């Protein structure tokens, strides 16, 4: 449309040397040109100074200072982040991640790495403390490394045990802009794909993660600037006490990529274990089952909201299931299970990080058991089957799945309590005059092998119907 009048004015131009002479006279006499250049870096052909130009464009894009010394060597330069492609330290590592991205045509991941390296050193201090602040992170990282190695000294456990129940976790050290990732949990479903063997080339995203970092806060805290574990209790870790240290206006963080919904009693348990307040302002509490459903539905997004009204449907092989997750059922205190989304847990010194993680592992395990109901499969109002189930919270870390007896007509309620990360105990609750359905250890076996409600309910139904 506008191109037609553009071609008409172009026909008027046919009816430019004077324009070049005008540009020359102005030469004898900003943002737009560089913006067009940064759009057009996509269309540059592969060549050595052109790739230097596109890397300079990445530098201008993420706010960093480019400097070439040749067509080979180009430096990205800011107050501490200084590295080349061919402050206060060497250029440490020829890291294969950045080189592997740049040897291919993967410049956006290079941009993400420079974004992460900006967000590491964007701390508010006058730059001197910044160095010391980064040093504190280094000390923390070293301590964290030792603890995982201490666990590898303790037992020669596989990576799965290192994830599920060990100290720290599967620990990927930092490399470029990617900060240090602890994998504290991987579910029995998310372990499997479409039956994964878990050998030490395990994926970064294969589970639930938490990245450790430093961040400037509004308060002042005392953090170590030295590797705090010089002496190690041979099966534990043991920390020499503080001061060294200095009172940086910052704190260590465990940032989760996807915010975890946690209950109120979790908030008090973690503020007891840490000592530092978690929610600086008090947030707006919500029922946990809303947050669990928003978490599980916002895993795989679609533009249509499900409009569930807490009545989820499950299409299974030899069965069809319905679930009522039943928020606002009152606890013994008289209130529903109220929780909020946590994303950043602040700790001061690294000895807290196993205990903190055990708490989060507990919480994440509980969410997976309530995560298995939240599905998008709509087998709406099918007259065959639709075994109508209910989930209610009797307490923190306990819940109950209530459902019709497969033989008789009284209710049967299976109460599940999540003791630890991989241990959930189960009790069948039955009328005094009913049929034998299952033993509790069978329910514990199916739960710990699958970590999903509907699979255990089908196991209950099938082992009832064989008898």
């Amino acid at each position: 449309l506008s191109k037609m009048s553009s071609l008409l004015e172009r026909l008027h131009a046919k009816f430019w040397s004077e324009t070049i002479k005008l540009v020359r006279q102005v030469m004898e006499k900003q943002h737009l040109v560089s913006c067009l250049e940064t759009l057009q870096k996509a269309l540059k052909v592969t060549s050595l100074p052109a790739m230097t130009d596109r890397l300079e464009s990445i530098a201008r894009q993420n706010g960093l200072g480019s400097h070439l010394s040749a067509s080979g060597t180009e430096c990205y330069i800011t107050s501490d982040m200084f590295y080349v492609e061919v402050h206060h330290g060497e250029n440490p590592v020829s890291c294969p991640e950045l080189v592997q991205q740049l040897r291919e045509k993967n410049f956006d991941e290079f941009s993400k790495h420079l974004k992460g390296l900006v967000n590491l050193y964007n701390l508010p201090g006058d730059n001197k403390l910044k160095t010391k602040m980064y040093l504190a992170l280094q000390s923390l990282e070293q301590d964290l490394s030792k603890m995982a190695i201490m666990y590898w000294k303790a037992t020669n456990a596989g990576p799965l045990d290192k994830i599920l129940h060990g100290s720290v976790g599967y620990l990927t050290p930092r490399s470029g802009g990617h900060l240090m990732n602890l994998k504290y949990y991987v579910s029995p479903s998310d372990l499997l794909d479409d039956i994964i063997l878990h050998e030490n080339n395990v994926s970064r995203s294969l589970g639930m993660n938490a990245s450790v970092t430093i961040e400037g806060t509004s308060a002042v805290y005392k953090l170590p600037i030295a590797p705090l574990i010089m002496g190690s209790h041979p099966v534990d870790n043991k920390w020499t006490p503080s001061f060294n240290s200095v009172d940086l206006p910052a704190c260590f963080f465990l940032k989760f990529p996807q915010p975890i919904p946690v209950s109120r009693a979790f908030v008090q348990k973690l503020q007891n274990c840490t000592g530092i307040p978690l929610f600086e302002t008090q947030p707006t509490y919500a029922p946990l089952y809303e947050l669990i459903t928003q978490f599980e539905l916002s895993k795989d997004p679609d533009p249509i909201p499900l409009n569930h009204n807490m009545r989820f449907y499950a299409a299974l092989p030899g069965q069809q299931h319905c679930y009522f997750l039943n928020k606002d059922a009152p606890l013994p205190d008289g209130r529903s299970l109220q929780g909020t989304l946590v994303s950043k847990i602040t700790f001061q010194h690294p000895g807290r990080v196993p205990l903190i993680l055990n708490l989060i592992r507990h919480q994440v395990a509980y969410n997976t058991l309530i995560g298995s109901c939240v599905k998008r499969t709509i087998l709406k109002e099918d007259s065959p089957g639709l075994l109508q189930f209910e989930v209610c919270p009797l307490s923190e870390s306990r819940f109950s799945v209530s459902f019709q007896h497969p033989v008789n007509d009284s209710l049967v309620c299976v109460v599940m309590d999540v003791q630890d990360s991989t241990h959930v105990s189960c009790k069948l609750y039955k009328g005094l005059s009913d049929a034998l359905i299952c033993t509790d250890d069978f329910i514990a076996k199916v739960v710990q092998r699958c970590m999903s409600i509907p699979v255990t309910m089908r196991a209950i139904r099938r082992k009832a119907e064989t008898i």
Binding site: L192, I195, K375, R376, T377, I378, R449, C450, T456
Partner: peptide
Amino acid sequence: AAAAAAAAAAAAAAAAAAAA
């Protein structure tokens, strides 16, 4: 919709194998 989720189907197979 009206389809067993593939991941759920795999978990069902694993559960059936356990305890014969």
